[PDB]
Design an enzyme around this catalytic site. Structure first.
Site, PDB file in Angstrom:
ATOM      1  N   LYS B 148     -80.919  53.848   0.301  1.00  0.00           N
ATOM      2  CA  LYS B 148     -81.278  53.697   1.706  1.00  0.00           C
ATOM      3  C   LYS B 148     -81.627  55.090   2.248  1.00  0.00           C
ATOM      4  N   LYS B 174     -82.871  51.244  -7.703  1.00  0.00           N
ATOM      5  CA  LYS B 174     -83.891  50.268  -7.296  1.00  0.00           C
ATOM      6  C   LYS B 174     -84.696  50.574  -6.036  1.00  0.00           C
ATOM      7  CE  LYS B 174     -83.152  46.752  -4.793  1.00  0.00           C
ATOM      8  NZ  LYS B 174     -83.696  45.395  -5.035  1.00  0.00           N
ATOM      9  N   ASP B 176     -86.459  49.572  -2.646  1.00  0.00           N
ATOM     10  CA  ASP B 176     -86.218  48.586  -1.588  1.00  0.00           C
ATOM     11  C   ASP B 176     -87.218  47.457  -1.786  1.00  0.00           C
ATOM     12  OD1 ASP B 176     -85.879  47.622   1.500  1.00  0.00           O
ATOM     13  OD2 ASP B 176     -84.334  49.101   0.934  1.00  0.00           O
ATOM     14  N   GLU B 177     -86.800  46.213  -1.574  1.00  0.00           N
ATOM     15  CA  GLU B 177     -87.637  45.091  -2.003  1.00  0.00           C
ATOM     16  C   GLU B 177     -88.944  44.907  -1.213  1.00  0.00           C
ATOM     17  OE1 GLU B 177     -85.227  44.400   0.102  1.00  0.00           O
ATOM     18  OE2 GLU B 177     -86.169  42.848   1.376  1.00  0.00           O
ATOM     19  N   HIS B 267     -85.889  40.254  -8.276  1.00  0.00           N
ATOM     20  CA  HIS B 267     -85.353  40.185  -6.939  1.00  0.00           C
ATOM     21  C   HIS B 267     -85.819  38.890  -6.308  1.00  0.00           C
ATOM     22  CE1 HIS B 267     -84.632  40.982  -2.722  1.00  0.00           C
ATOM     23  NE2 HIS B 267     -83.980  42.086  -3.040  1.00  0.00           N
ATOM     24  N   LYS B 307     -69.570  36.439   0.969  1.00  0.00           N
ATOM     25  CA  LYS B 307     -69.555  34.978   1.146  1.00  0.00           C
ATOM     26  C   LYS B 307     -68.234  34.402   0.623  1.00  0.00           C
TER      27      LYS B 307
END
Lengths: 115, 442, 107, 438, 134
Positions: B148, B174, B176-177, B267, B307
């Site tokens: 980030k 990775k 960022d998508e 992704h 979750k």
């Protein structure tokens, strides 16, 4: 279930039917004051009752006093009898539906025992 | 006179099977629905023996508890479907049946791909076992992390941050998508500098390093142009957004990967649009079997601890579904049909986002050795110490497991002890003054 | 005298009209689900619509399942749109009475 | 406080704008939601203020309690040029998973003119397409064969010929037919090609069939598309959704290069666009197909189902150059296209002949009226019925007639000139509801 | 009756703009010149709504000091120009208008490329910032 559509139709149909019933009210009252017009209006409206605004457009082209009179009559009718409507329709439909299922259940058991 | 609902038909092994859950509109009987769904997805028109091609709805049951919800099982002849083409499978199953006026809602829950059809797909370009031998990483899950922020960062500098991480003891990094090629970070440059970080950090750690390069592009031509060039740089791994890019484009990329021996990270951007709602759409469980089939070596399975319950059971289920070769039907974990894969390699589930170090013992006890635990954002000392922290925490966890300790009941200590050896790990753990609820006593 | 049987008849009419609306729903739902039955139903229904209660009686003798179904639909439409009609037929006529009087006032 | 909710920001023209409808979870303030949705889809040495996506207006959807409309502005730099894929990924990628939202749905997107200028769009589009097909002054006819498989390509080919010679403009491949064991694709192509060539010659009218190029791999899709090009086929079809935007964007550029019209089938759309409370509405997807590339697009039937108000809207959106915001028709923001060409809407499924005059008056000359199955006399007379019915309608309109209150007559009249149209109308004894008079 | 000189037209953002300076020949009024320059570079022929494509000359002013020299501002619809093609831009703007018999001299001074058009060009292969990092 496309209730938005089913509501606007029942509104336009009920409106077209409250136009027909407004015609019945002015006809029976003008039946005592004008026999020639009670037959004139009967002749002109014969089979044109199926649309509320298609009827008013043609009556404005003939007699504007007769067109405005129906407009105030149908104005009064809806403002009066519309509040009680829903209670009657539903209970009416539910009374009938429940009874038709009983009759179906009685026709069900009459075919059950004969099998 | 409805030949599309056959309650007695026992499915052949070569059949494709599908379990839908639906809410029928007021008036519609359940058998009318399941049959229409069967007809539409298959023939549907209503001197030959058409019987072969007609898809049969063979079992219907109401969902335990939920009122006005039913499960509909439908069988599909192996002949209905084009080979290697998930696209065609989808278009055949989910193409139309979702629009029915006589249905309040429809959700596709699971599909049984027959072994006979599975055999017509390439599957993962390498898959779990191969990839370990390729990277030389064994005996532990794999550590990745996200950088980030997104844009507002030059190539030189993104690259610098990637180096800082990888050098600090992480396997992967990775893009960022939503990073493809924008007015202030054209891909060719992002690729140059990322490559440099890998080579350097790799030589400096003496450990295989990789960054998932986002080749997701506007056209198949462009998408390939990039993968082709990531290859040229000798990169061991690229990433691709299979859902927003689409399944055709992916099937293509996954083959290319096998041909060039390049690992393929996947992704699932935009998955939540389809898979969120209980009452409508497709469940991610399906899309995962699909992603397995089309191709890919990793796949974001989301985390299991942010979750809560019921994702848990359902997620455990489909982690198994993308990893193993044979999966027993178990309704309690959301697995509707027994699935085989006839030695088609497994996909590494990737536990992504919202997770920090404290989660480590839990993650290992849940996902085990064959997982990728992504860590995007943030440690008080920078990228490298942050990476080290996460790395030591992991190493500490694996050994604690191998020694035979209860990572749920002992997770706390296993970290606190390891922390007395890594000040970076200390700083990180001490950043979260954790909350416990005891009721009043005495 | 008037309003009592004016509303009484209008209720029987609304009853019949929703049955037609229940039929046209079951038509469309079958339009996709069972074209054969949808075709049959449409042809059988033609003209009959007049009386809603007589219609179910007639449909019961032919295909009882379909008669039952329409009964549950008409019941569902009534319960779910009835409350809202009075606030629409009144304000629909009132909107039509103010608009048509504007046309007369100019020409 | 949050710098992702800026209630005073006026959008720059060059921004990308998005309208979301959401229900926040019990407790979650609306502004927090709109701001997180903004933050996540955009960004989060901080001269970052350029790149951040701002949430610049929130309002409650009238009637519906716990429903909000959130407007978000995005800078022209966030998005890769010509990439519909990246557009989506940036907008829909993740904002839909928030635990603080019960449901999120993407209603509309204003693509700025500067971004639109970086897309090819339709390889031809309405205007051009007519000049190519030589069809003018009426909506174009097509129809779908039934069933799919169980027909040898020789027969599908015979069936197609029956329809094109019957007086149709197009026929279509059943959308789940790519290449299955009992109808391999190249065979279908051959026999469809031959059906066009015959029927076109005998009629003296340009004939077409939407050949279904949709395939597993891009490599394979091009193999099909361009062997179709080899046959001299005027049009091919593609399932843009189940195949993918990348895969399509590709095909559409190819189509412009090879001058082949593109028929876009919207398979799988119901999985996304059906539910009011969650997903992406079709109007968005429609704009993205216009952006990616396509000359035809199934905008679905109108006369079945609100549907109307919202459908007419995006039909406007895929046809016109400038579209004024009008919430009542679903148009959230004004949209320019800067001379990017329009896509022909396709009315598909459920419609038989009686619908004809409606379909003409609703859609106009720039539409494709697709008629998938069945006339009591076979394909050819079915095709003739539907053509006469249409010709009759175009002329009835041009003479000045009211296609709503006159539709009935217009068909019954021309019905006395085509016995094929007569038998078609006979099949549907109409239902009208009259209230008890007298 | 000259529709190529529109003194009131406020340019759209998506327009291409161009500032010429010219010396008109003895007799020629300035507005005749600017309009001809506008017409020639755009449509120029003299049932449709052509208005979209006609390039409009929207402001004229004399150069401070210099006698017999004027600035002419002209707006061009975004649709006149092929994408990524400077060639086409040139051919459209400087192609012909320089040869006018009614003009002593013409000099093109500046062009406003609209953002909408700028976006259709690749620009520098790397540019200042990238190249430093390179």
């Amino acid at each position: 279930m496309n209730l938005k559509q089913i509501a606007k139709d029942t509104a336009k149909t009920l409106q077209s039917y409250l136009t027909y019933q407004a015609l019945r009210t002015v006809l029976a009252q003008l039946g005592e004051t004008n026999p020639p017009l009670a037959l004139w209006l009967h002749n002109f409206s014969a089979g044109k009752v199926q649309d509320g605004e298609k009827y008013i457009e043609e009556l404005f082209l003939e007699k504007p006093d007769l067109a405005l009179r129906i407009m105030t009559v149908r104005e009064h009718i809806a403002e009066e009898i519309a509040e009680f409507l829903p209670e009657m329709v539903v209970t009416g439909i539910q009374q009938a539906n429940m009874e038709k299922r009983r009759q179906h259940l009685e026709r069900m058991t009459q075919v059950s025992l004969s099998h | 006179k409805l030949t599309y609902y056959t309650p007695d038909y026992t499915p052949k092994d070569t059949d494709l099977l599908a379990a839908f859950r639906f809410s029928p509109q007021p008036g519609v009987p359940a058998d009318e629905a399941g049959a229409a769904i069967a007809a539409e997805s298959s023939t549907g028109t209503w001197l030959t023996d058409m019987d072969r091609y007609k898809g049969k709805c063979y079992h219907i049951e109401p969902v335990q508890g939920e009122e006005n919800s039913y499960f509909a099982f439908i069988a599909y002849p192996l002949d209905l479907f084009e080979e290697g083409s998930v696209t065609n499978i989808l278009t055949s199953i989910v193409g139309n049946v979702f629009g029915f006026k006589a249905i309040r809602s429809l959700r596709l829950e699971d599909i049984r791909f027959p072994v006979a059809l599975v055999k017509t797909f390439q599957g993962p370009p390498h898959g779990i076992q191969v990839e370990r031998d390729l990277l030389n990483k064994y005996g532990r899950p794999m550590l990745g992390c996200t950088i980030k922020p997104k844009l507002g960062l030059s190539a030189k500098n993104y690259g610098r941050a990637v180096y800082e991480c990888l050098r600090g003891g992480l396997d992967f990094t990775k893009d960022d998508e939503n990073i493809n090629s924008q007015p202030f970070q054209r891909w060719r440059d992002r690729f140059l500098f990322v490559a440099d970080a890998i080579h350097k950090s790799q030589a400096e750690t003496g450990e295989i390093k990789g960054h998932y390069l986002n080749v997701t592009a506007p056209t198949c031509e462009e998408m390939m142009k990039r993968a082709e060039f990531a290859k040229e740089l000798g990169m061991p791994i690229i990433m691709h957004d299979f859902l927003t890019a689409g399944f055709t484009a992916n099937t293509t990329l996954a083959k290319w990967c096998r041909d060039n021996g390049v690992l393929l990270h996947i992704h699932r951007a935009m998955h939540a649009v389809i898979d969120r709602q209980r009452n409508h759409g497709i469940h991610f469980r399906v899309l995962a079997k699909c992603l397995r089939l089309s191709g890919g070596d990793h796949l974001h399975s989301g985390t299991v601890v942010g979750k809560l319950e019921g994702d848990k059971a359902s997620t455990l289920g489909f982690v198994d579904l993308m990893r193993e070769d044979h999966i027993e039907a178990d309704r309690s974990r959301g697995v509707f049909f027994t699935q085989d894969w006839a030695s088609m390699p497994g996909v590494l589930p990737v536990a992504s986002g919202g997770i920090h170090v404290w989660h480590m013992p839990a993650l290992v006890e849940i996902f085990g050795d064959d997982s990728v635990l992504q860590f995007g954002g943030g440690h008080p000392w920078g990228n490298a110490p942050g990476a080290t922290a996460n790395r030591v925490a992991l190493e500490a966890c694996v050994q604690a497991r191998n020694e035979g300790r209860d990572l749920y009941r002992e997770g706390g200590d296993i970290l606190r002890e390891a922390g007395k050896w890594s000040p970076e790990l200390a700083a990180a753990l001490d950043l979260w003054k954790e909350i416990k609820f005891e009721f009043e006593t005495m």
